[PDB]
Amino acid sequence: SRRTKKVGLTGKYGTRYGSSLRKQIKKIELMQHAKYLCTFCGKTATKRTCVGIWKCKKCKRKVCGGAWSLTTPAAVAAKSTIIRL
Amino acid sequence: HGASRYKKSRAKMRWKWKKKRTRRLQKKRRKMRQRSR
Amino acid sequence: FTKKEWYDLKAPKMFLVRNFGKTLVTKTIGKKLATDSLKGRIYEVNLADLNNDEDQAHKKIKLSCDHIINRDCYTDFCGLSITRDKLCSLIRKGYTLIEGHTDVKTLDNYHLRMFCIAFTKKRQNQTKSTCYAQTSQIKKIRKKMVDIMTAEASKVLLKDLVKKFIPESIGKEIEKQCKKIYPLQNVLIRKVKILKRPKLDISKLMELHT
Amino acid sequence: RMYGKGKGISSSTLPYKRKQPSWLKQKPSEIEDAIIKLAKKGQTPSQIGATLRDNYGIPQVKSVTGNKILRILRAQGIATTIPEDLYFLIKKAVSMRKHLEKNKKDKDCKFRLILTESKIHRISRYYKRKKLLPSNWKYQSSTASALIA
Amino acid sequence: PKKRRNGGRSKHNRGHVNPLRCSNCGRCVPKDKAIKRFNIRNIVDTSAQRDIKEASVYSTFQLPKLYIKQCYCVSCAIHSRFVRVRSREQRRVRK
Amino acid sequence: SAGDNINAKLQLVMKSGKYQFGRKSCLKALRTGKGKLVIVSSNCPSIQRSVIEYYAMLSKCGVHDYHGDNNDLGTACGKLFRISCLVITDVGDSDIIK
Amino acid sequence: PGRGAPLAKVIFKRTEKYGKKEELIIASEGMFTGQYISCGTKAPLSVGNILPIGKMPEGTLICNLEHRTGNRGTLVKASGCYATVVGQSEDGKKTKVRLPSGAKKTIDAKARAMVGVVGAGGRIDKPILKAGVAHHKYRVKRNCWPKV
Amino acid sequence: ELVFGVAHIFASFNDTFIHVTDLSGRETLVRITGGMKVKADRDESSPYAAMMAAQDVAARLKELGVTAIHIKLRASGGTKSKTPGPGAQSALRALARSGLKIGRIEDVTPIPTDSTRKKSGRRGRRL
Amino acid sequence: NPDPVEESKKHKLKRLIPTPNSYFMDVKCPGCLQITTLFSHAQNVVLCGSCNIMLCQPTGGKCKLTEGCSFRKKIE
RNA sequence: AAUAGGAGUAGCUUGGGGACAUUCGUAUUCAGAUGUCAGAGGUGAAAUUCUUAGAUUUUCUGGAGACGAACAACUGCGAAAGCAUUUGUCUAAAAUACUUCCAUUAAUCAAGAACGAAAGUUAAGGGAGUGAAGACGAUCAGAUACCGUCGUAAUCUUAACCAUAAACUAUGCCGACUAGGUGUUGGAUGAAGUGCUUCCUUCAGUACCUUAUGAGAAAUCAAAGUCUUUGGGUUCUGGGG
């Protein structure tokens, strides 16, 4: 936080790799390391344990999700569509 | 001119064109600054 | 050019003349038998010229070719439009245009899309030129217009629905209910389209044609 | 009008007479009892005053009693610490913020949310300047719903 | 100075009025600013109408009307002699 | 409208009713037969909801579904932790029944 | 890691015998542990169910298609990917679907597919950070790199 | 007695096409444009040419045995213009002169029912 | 001059001397058989005190009252 | 309890206010058909261009992107930018009404912040038409232009950004007082067309027309008036080219 001006969480990368790539990495990593709200117990502890899998620690349960975030806009729309029909 | 733009009376060449020439000129000068630094 | 040969255009039992002309069709060759060419094609029929009342010339109906024997094609209903000249004429400024629609199925499993226009009435109490209705009212009218129309379409068979269209009975029923919300004027069904007209039940089609 | 471009002046206009209706039979104790019943049942002072005028037929509490209803509510100890106006505004702002959390593309909701929050801060600053609101107390963006429930 | 009180159009209590495109030069032009002529017109005149009617079936029938709505820009309207320039005072005198 | 109406009732129950929140207390109250009304979120566990409903049915106690989250029922009751389900053990100024 | 997305361990009970039998299915996005998955002709339409393509309503999104019935999900297997049903034959028997390449193809209606989109979507969106990360990728794939 | 065809009259302003067909459209009867009749290879739109084209169509229809026509007028693409072509009136008058029997006449000019963008810059064509 | 004016009351709520437009009415209903004070511009449905059934219909422009019933105007 | 302010409550109040879903129509375009036979496109006038492997033209299916016409206005809403298919959902808004509540909460505001057309940037889609660039044919004294034919980037959506426009009621915003009439949109009050509809009165909007021994340099302006008869409150800006 109160260390770097603009590179923030990609400051560990900072001395290496193109700035635009570090910008692209920053957006993805912000999503990646976020702790999501669990549908199966109501706490914001849901973390990614491997690429497609987001596990709640508290209720010990594996939700399949996107690579860098819990759900794609595509899957939500598909789910919604199926309920709609 | 003044700070205020255009105001074609009789005037001269187009203000937008004068502005185009200066925007192009400022870039050219910025290239001279780049050559320098 | 090469030779072609006239074949008679019949109309269903509901239409008074039952014979609305002759069409020429190219002479037969091997494997392509001209029956195929006669079948499936579409005719723009002006309605008045079948029943013999000139009032109904503002509509046209579309007729498809669905059964042929020898030199005769029986034909079936496929859709309905108002003539453009009449429609443009009906549209008058200072009054409120409402158009409803819904997608619907007919008792005998014919699937249609039906398009119903309506104008606000002139009346004696409008005084000044602006006779536009309020938007909440036209939404209520639009919902009501669709509700009456879907009820009218669903009830009966195809022939009876076509019969309802001709003197515009649906439009009269729509007018009677919606007058209460606000006075209306020419409420017509502008267009009718089939979505899914049955491929099967040729036998019933022939019987309907009679 | 505070923020609106318009300027409607529709409002209450009392009669010139500021004393008791002639036909009234009730003493202050009866009006107090009616207020107590409504208040206890969970009505707030505007709702009580409107109910008293409409349901019970009795206009302005200041005319039929020696006191004014928020004062009476405080005096009988029923009164909320939070005012009606602040409660409704916070709920409205929470409603906008909840909605904005769901739907991020609503610019008008964001604009309204900042406007309403600005009115919340103004009302808070006034109540703090009065002896009404604790010095330590302050509005905060997202905890407010839990705070005032 | 200001020649036109309304700017030659009708944009009051509005930031934008949608463009239509001209029937003549093809330019984009706001619908209030645009010179719109509804134009109810008959297909042919009298000898032609007589001949086609005689050739025609039907005692009842009469030819379709032409419903156009023709949009002119300011240049177009002066160019094809559609409108006059009035006179300075007279530029407020509507038909 | 409906969630708001329920929230007003819950606010009244919080203010002047006597209530008890969470699974173990809620079961104990039902088992006792002290409970007047059980309000269960759909975001409760299937099994936890089912047990409470069975207990309520046996003990002749009404159950009401809450639409909002377990957390939302907690913030509705003015707390920062989830409640999921509560049982009213004395009715407040609340209109829980006709 | 050879597959772009997770596998799902699914338990059925032996129809011809007794006891529990374990399958390996490709995990759909929004799949979860303790999710119930239904498979068959009379199965209800819902995400991750395994249905003949003939029984999909048009414009639905599906994954794990097979080019012939009982070939066991040979098509549409990569992460985040999906096919769309683009038409159903008037006299049945055939069904028209749209491959994740955008290509349209006609298969028999009887052939199965799996409702929804494959897990681990957006994987390609992150750029490759470094040569060691590329090494770790090829270490679980194939002998194919450095690519001179 | 009478045998009816449908006379599509398609006017592009640049030319006036007379294309008569069966009442289904399918199985056409005469193509004659108007521009086919122009012998100077310039100034393509002409009422005279449209009249000659109509006379040829009438000759051909008499040769065929179609004794009556229903008329469908259409001006261009209706995005290009809403104007009917000059020779259209001539084509109509020639059909009237011919002695072929004239049934229902309709406009089917195909104007857009929307407002999607069209040819030339936003300041229009300067021609 | 404005002092003896009588036709000033037509204007907006705030006049030369501001006044309420609103008034009270003594109302009685068939079958209910009870006489009750009620407010022009009341904002809720009002039930009979004798039994349980409704009397007045509220609305924005004054009140919509009842199709039957008789109403005397309250005077001080 | 302010012809101040805020909050409430009420009415099948209102509307192209905002967001999400949904759905329809049409032209256009592509592919699949379909019937023709010589030209069709295009313009000051032609040619480049397309067409006998069947173009243009006719009718039909299926797909696709695009838009929402006519209706539609000296018409509505929006802080401004801006906003027009159908229905639903989530939302906000103002006026009217109020013998509802509060009790001066206000006004305008350096600093700071939000939103902010078109273009531009960056990424994913999508990429039909239109079409900066670019290519030819002309036009012409030449023409790299207007004009014709073709046509990438862009236009469209999502996700970030960018923060300027004659972003103009070229009129800062609030306040009072001045002068009439014709209209007009949203309510409330009364009376008469047949509960509804009309008309009358009245509010908040909103334009126009005429009048200013009012103003101004006049144009014009009911505000730009009530300012050498100069002080209702306040913010911002300018000092010949």
mmCIF file of C-alpha atoms (C1' of nucleotides) in Angstrom, chain J residues 17-224:
data_model
loop_
_atom_site.group_PDB
_atom_site.id
_atom_site.type_symbol
_atom_site.label_atom_id
_atom_site.label_comp_id
_atom_site.label_asym_id
_atom_site.label_seq_id
_atom_site.Cartn_x
_atom_site.Cartn_y
_atom_site.Cartn_z
ATOM 1 C "C1'" G J 17 -34.941 10.065 -16.485
ATOM 2 C "C1'" G J 18 -30.918 5.738 -15.248
ATOM 3 C "C1'" A J 19 -29.465 0.269 -15.090
ATOM 4 C "C1'" C J 20 -30.412 -5.066 -16.177
ATOM 5 C "C1'" A J 21 -33.188 -8.733 -18.675
ATOM 6 C "C1'" U J 22 -36.699 -9.511 -22.752
ATOM 7 C "C1'" U J 23 -38.867 -9.028 -27.455
ATOM 8 C "C1'" C J 24 -40.576 -7.135 -32.436
ATOM 9 C "C1'" G J 25 -40.314 -4.916 -37.161
ATOM 10 C "C1'" U J 26 -38.071 -3.448 -41.477
ATOM 11 C "C1'" A J 27 -34.815 -2.352 -45.032
ATOM 12 C "C1'" U J 28 -29.860 -3.881 -46.060
ATOM 13 C "C1'" U J 29 -26.387 -7.832 -46.571
ATOM 14 C "C1'" C J 30 -24.662 -12.939 -47.053
ATOM 15 C "C1'" A J 31 -25.532 -18.069 -48.148
ATOM 16 C "C1'" G J 32 -29.083 -21.543 -50.138
ATOM 17 C "C1'" A J 33 -32.713 -21.794 -53.741
ATOM 18 C "C1'" U J 34 -35.985 -19.429 -58.050
ATOM 19 C "C1'" G J 35 -37.290 -17.804 -63.059
ATOM 20 C "C1'" U J 36 -35.346 -14.767 -67.155
ATOM 21 C "C1'" C J 37 -31.918 -13.333 -71.327
ATOM 22 C "C1'" A J 38 -28.319 -8.775 -72.549
ATOM 23 C "C1'" G J 39 -26.851 -5.588 -70.630
ATOM 24 C "C1'" A J 40 -26.670 -3.410 -65.385
ATOM 25 C "C1'" G J 41 -24.314 0.167 -62.106
ATOM 26 C "C1'" G J 42 -22.964 5.038 -62.284
ATOM 27 C "C1'" U J 43 -22.627 11.272 -63.743
ATOM 28 C "C1'" G J 44 -22.781 18.416 -65.780
ATOM 29 C "C1'" A J 45 -21.307 14.103 -69.401
ATOM 30 C "C1'" A J 46 -19.130 9.757 -69.046
ATOM 31 C "C1'" A J 47 -15.776 6.251 -67.941
ATOM 32 C "C1'" U J 48 -13.332 3.106 -63.866
ATOM 33 C "C1'" U J 49 -16.801 -0.907 -62.010
ATOM 34 C "C1'" C J 50 -20.081 -5.543 -62.283
ATOM 35 C "C1'" U J 51 -22.410 -8.857 -66.136
ATOM 36 C "C1'" U J 52 -23.223 -15.432 -70.712
ATOM 37 C "C1'" A J 53 -19.364 -19.351 -65.194
ATOM 38 C "C1'" G J 54 -26.461 -15.870 -66.259
ATOM 39 C "C1'" A J 55 -25.452 -9.652 -63.721
ATOM 40 C "C1'" U J 56 -29.302 -6.182 -62.851
ATOM 41 C "C1'" U J 57 -34.568 -7.498 -62.204
ATOM 42 C "C1'" U J 58 -38.791 -11.320 -59.758
ATOM 43 C "C1'" U J 59 -40.340 -14.444 -55.618
ATOM 44 C "C1'" C J 60 -39.048 -17.597 -51.590
ATOM 45 C "C1'" U J 61 -36.235 -19.858 -47.243
ATOM 46 C "C1'" G J 62 -32.384 -19.721 -43.577
ATOM 47 C "C1'" G J 63 -28.469 -16.612 -41.255
ATOM 48 C "C1'" A J 64 -26.167 -12.068 -39.827
ATOM 49 C "C1'" G J 65 -25.000 -7.396 -38.193
ATOM 50 C "C1'" A J 66 -27.650 -2.246 -38.045
ATOM 51 C "C1'" C J 67 -31.299 0.818 -36.771
ATOM 52 C "C1'" G J 68 -36.072 2.159 -34.743
ATOM 53 C "C1'" A J 69 -38.783 5.251 -39.376
ATOM 54 C "C1'" A J 70 -43.759 7.076 -41.006
ATOM 55 C "C1'" C J 71 -46.482 8.289 -36.629
ATOM 56 C "C1'" A J 72 -43.197 12.976 -34.495
ATOM 57 C "C1'" A J 73 -44.570 18.527 -32.881
ATOM 58 C "C1'" C J 74 -42.194 26.901 -32.274
ATOM 59 C "C1'" U J 75 -43.815 17.908 -28.368
ATOM 60 C "C1'" G J 76 -41.996 15.222 -23.169
ATOM 61 C "C1'" C J 77 -38.036 13.924 -19.628
ATOM 62 C "C1'" G J 78 -32.883 14.619 -18.083
ATOM 63 C "C1'" A J 79 -27.495 18.125 -13.426
ATOM 64 C "C1'" A J 80 -25.352 18.732 -17.969
ATOM 65 C "C1'" A J 81 -23.500 15.477 -21.482
ATOM 66 C "C1'" G J 82 -27.875 13.134 -23.303
ATOM 67 C "C1'" C J 83 -32.315 10.240 -23.761
ATOM 68 C "C1'" A J 84 -37.415 7.454 -28.667
ATOM 69 C "C1'" U J 85 -39.363 -1.032 -30.676
ATOM 70 C "C1'" U J 86 -42.402 -4.620 -27.052
ATOM 71 C "C1'" U J 87 -42.940 -6.361 -22.120
ATOM 72 C "C1'" G J 88 -40.865 -7.400 -17.392
ATOM 73 C "C1'" U J 89 -37.518 -6.406 -13.177
ATOM 74 C "C1'" C J 90 -34.452 -3.245 -10.178
ATOM 75 C "C1'" U J 91 -34.378 1.961 -9.576
ATOM 76 C "C1'" A J 92 -34.466 7.021 -9.111
ATOM 77 C "C1'" A J 93 -37.591 12.297 -10.113
ATOM 78 C "C1'" A J 94 -40.643 16.588 -9.792
ATOM 79 C "C1'" A J 95 -45.155 18.907 -9.163
ATOM 80 C "C1'" U J 96 -49.760 18.658 -6.924
ATOM 81 C "C1'" A J 97 -52.152 17.676 -1.981
ATOM 82 C "C1'" C J 98 -51.508 17.907 3.432
ATOM 83 C "C1'" U J 99 -55.060 21.641 10.431
ATOM 84 C "C1'" U J 100 -48.096 15.311 8.918
ATOM 85 C "C1'" C J 101 -42.909 16.028 11.292
ATOM 86 C "C1'" C J 102 -38.617 18.962 12.337
ATOM 87 C "C1'" A J 103 -37.268 23.974 13.999
ATOM 88 C "C1'" U J 104 -33.169 27.440 10.845
ATOM 89 C "C1'" U J 105 -31.172 23.273 9.132
ATOM 90 C "C1'" A J 106 -29.845 28.107 4.527
ATOM 91 C "C1'" A J 107 -27.728 30.842 -0.163
ATOM 92 C "C1'" U J 108 -23.539 31.206 -3.342
ATOM 93 C "C1'" C J 109 -18.896 28.772 -2.721
ATOM 94 C "C1'" A J 110 -11.469 29.110 -3.292
ATOM 95 C "C1'" A J 111 -9.383 23.831 -2.091
ATOM 96 C "C1'" G J 112 -10.923 18.928 -3.473
ATOM 97 C "C1'" A J 113 -14.345 15.380 -5.837
ATOM 98 C "C1'" A J 114 -18.125 13.084 -9.084
ATOM 99 C "C1'" C J 115 -20.404 12.781 -13.989
ATOM 100 C "C1'" G J 116 -18.959 14.609 -18.759
ATOM 101 C "C1'" A J 117 -20.724 14.336 -26.939
ATOM 102 C "C1'" A J 118 -17.709 13.274 -31.135
ATOM 103 C "C1'" A J 119 -12.700 11.804 -31.951
ATOM 104 C "C1'" G J 120 -8.044 9.393 -29.826
ATOM 105 C "C1'" U J 121 -5.455 5.279 -26.777
ATOM 106 C "C1'" U J 122 -5.371 -0.295 -24.967
ATOM 107 C "C1'" A J 123 -7.529 -5.038 -24.753
ATOM 108 C "C1'" A J 124 -11.080 -8.859 -25.993
ATOM 109 C "C1'" G J 125 -15.312 -9.839 -29.070
ATOM 110 C "C1'" G J 126 -18.257 -8.669 -33.365
ATOM 111 C "C1'" G J 127 -16.444 -6.665 -38.096
ATOM 112 C "C1'" A J 128 -23.211 -6.121 -42.069
ATOM 113 C "C1'" G J 129 -23.850 -1.313 -44.014
ATOM 114 C "C1'" U J 130 -21.362 3.481 -43.574
ATOM 115 C "C1'" G J 131 -16.411 4.321 -44.126
ATOM 116 C "C1'" A J 132 -10.421 9.043 -41.773
ATOM 117 C "C1'" A J 133 -6.243 6.116 -44.632
ATOM 118 C "C1'" G J 134 -5.311 4.024 -49.242
ATOM 119 C "C1'" A J 135 -6.370 2.548 -54.647
ATOM 120 C "C1'" C J 136 -8.150 3.519 -59.439
ATOM 121 C "C1'" G J 137 -11.715 6.423 -63.454
ATOM 122 C "C1'" A J 138 -12.462 11.098 -64.471
ATOM 123 C "C1'" U J 139 -13.195 16.363 -64.035
ATOM 124 C "C1'" C J 140 -9.627 20.160 -65.446
ATOM 125 C "C1'" A J 141 -4.606 24.177 -67.809
ATOM 126 C "C1'" G J 142 -3.025 20.804 -64.066
ATOM 127 C "C1'" A J 143 -6.682 18.484 -59.587
ATOM 128 C "C1'" U J 144 -2.852 14.605 -55.424
ATOM 129 C "C1'" A J 145 -9.938 18.168 -54.560
ATOM 130 C "C1'" C J 146 -15.178 18.597 -55.067
ATOM 131 C "C1'" C J 147 -17.721 13.975 -58.520
ATOM 132 C "C1'" G J 148 -17.778 8.392 -59.746
ATOM 133 C "C1'" U J 149 -16.252 3.045 -58.502
ATOM 134 C "C1'" C J 150 -13.488 0.178 -54.842
ATOM 135 C "C1'" G J 151 -11.866 0.081 -49.970
ATOM 136 C "C1'" U J 152 -8.669 -1.277 -45.269
ATOM 137 C "C1'" A J 153 -8.451 1.561 -39.659
ATOM 138 C "C1'" A J 154 -12.775 3.193 -37.284
ATOM 139 C "C1'" U J 155 -18.034 3.057 -36.635
ATOM 140 C "C1'" C J 156 -21.241 -1.606 -32.842
ATOM 141 C "C1'" U J 157 -20.712 -4.442 -27.677
ATOM 142 C "C1'" U J 158 -18.030 -5.689 -23.324
ATOM 143 C "C1'" A J 159 -13.705 -4.118 -20.351
ATOM 144 C "C1'" A J 160 -10.335 -0.194 -19.144
ATOM 145 C "C1'" C J 161 -8.840 4.665 -20.082
ATOM 146 C "C1'" C J 162 -8.735 9.540 -22.032
ATOM 147 C "C1'" A J 163 -11.489 14.750 -19.888
ATOM 148 C "C1'" U J 164 -11.930 18.364 -24.415
ATOM 149 C "C1'" A J 165 -16.357 20.772 -28.248
ATOM 150 C "C1'" A J 166 -19.858 27.126 -31.283
ATOM 151 C "C1'" A J 167 -19.879 21.108 -24.171
ATOM 152 C "C1'" C J 168 -24.353 28.406 -26.744
ATOM 153 C "C1'" U J 169 -30.741 30.178 -23.228
ATOM 154 C "C1'" A J 170 -22.388 32.991 -27.088
ATOM 155 C "C1'" U J 171 -26.848 35.438 -21.092
ATOM 156 C "C1'" G J 172 -22.999 32.382 -13.674
ATOM 157 C "C1'" C J 173 -26.463 30.916 -9.813
ATOM 158 C "C1'" C J 174 -29.982 32.131 -6.114
ATOM 159 C "C1'" G J 175 -33.640 36.636 -4.431
ATOM 160 C "C1'" A J 176 -37.579 40.009 -4.675
ATOM 161 C "C1'" C J 177 -40.438 43.520 -7.607
ATOM 162 C "C1'" U J 178 -42.273 44.948 -12.216
ATOM 163 C "C1'" A J 179 -47.606 43.872 -18.346
ATOM 164 C "C1'" G J 180 -50.595 42.093 -20.863
ATOM 165 C "C1'" G J 181 -52.723 38.618 -24.298
ATOM 166 C "C1'" U J 182 -52.405 33.900 -27.471
ATOM 167 C "C1'" G J 183 -50.988 28.981 -26.652
ATOM 168 C "C1'" U J 184 -49.038 24.557 -24.257
ATOM 169 C "C1'" U J 185 -47.507 19.916 -20.593
ATOM 170 C "C1'" G J 186 -48.400 17.947 -15.579
ATOM 171 C "C1'" G J 187 -51.840 18.267 -11.115
ATOM 172 C "C1'" A J 188 -55.927 20.366 -7.791
ATOM 173 C "C1'" U J 189 -60.875 23.466 -7.539
ATOM 174 C "C1'" G J 190 -65.727 24.401 -9.321
ATOM 175 C "C1'" A J 191 -69.909 24.050 -13.406
ATOM 176 C "C1'" A J 192 -72.413 21.508 -17.853
ATOM 177 C "C1'" G J 193 -71.671 17.211 -22.141
ATOM 178 C "C1'" U J 194 -72.787 11.909 -21.705
ATOM 179 C "C1'" G J 195 -69.185 7.306 -12.964
ATOM 180 C "C1'" C J 196 -66.617 9.149 -17.212
ATOM 181 C "C1'" U J 197 -65.899 13.229 -20.601
ATOM 182 C "C1'" U J 198 -65.773 18.205 -21.564
ATOM 183 C "C1'" C J 199 -65.529 23.562 -20.021
ATOM 184 C "C1'" C J 200 -64.360 27.260 -15.932
ATOM 185 C "C1'" U J 201 -60.975 28.833 -11.990
ATOM 186 C "C1'" U J 202 -55.973 27.942 -9.952
ATOM 187 C "C1'" C J 203 -50.974 26.206 -9.186
ATOM 188 C "C1'" A J 204 -45.690 24.457 -10.921
ATOM 189 C "C1'" G J 205 -43.371 24.015 -15.705
ATOM 190 C "C1'" U J 206 -43.095 26.051 -20.881
ATOM 191 C "C1'" A J 207 -42.980 28.750 -25.442
ATOM 192 C "C1'" C J 208 -44.803 32.615 -28.678
ATOM 193 C "C1'" C J 209 -47.155 37.469 -30.006
ATOM 194 C "C1'" U J 210 -47.960 42.755 -28.855
ATOM 195 C "C1'" U J 211 -46.518 46.679 -25.322
ATOM 196 C "C1'" A J 212 -42.625 48.920 -23.033
ATOM 197 C "C1'" U J 213 -41.795 58.618 -21.203
ATOM 198 C "C1'" G J 214 -38.321 50.536 -19.119
ATOM 199 C "C1'" A J 215 -33.238 49.416 -20.767
ATOM 200 C "C1'" G J 216 -29.523 49.498 -24.339
ATOM 201 C "C1'" A J 217 -24.580 51.393 -29.180
ATOM 202 C "C1'" A J 218 -28.552 49.607 -31.885
ATOM 203 C "C1'" A J 219 -29.848 44.838 -33.114
ATOM 204 C "C1'" U J 220 -32.738 43.333 -29.629
ATOM 205 C "C1'" C J 221 -34.062 42.056 -24.431
ATOM 206 C "C1'" A J 222 -40.192 40.793 -19.775
ATOM 207 C "C1'" A J 223 -34.715 40.385 -19.244
ATOM 208 C "C1'" A J 224 -30.208 42.414 -21.263
#
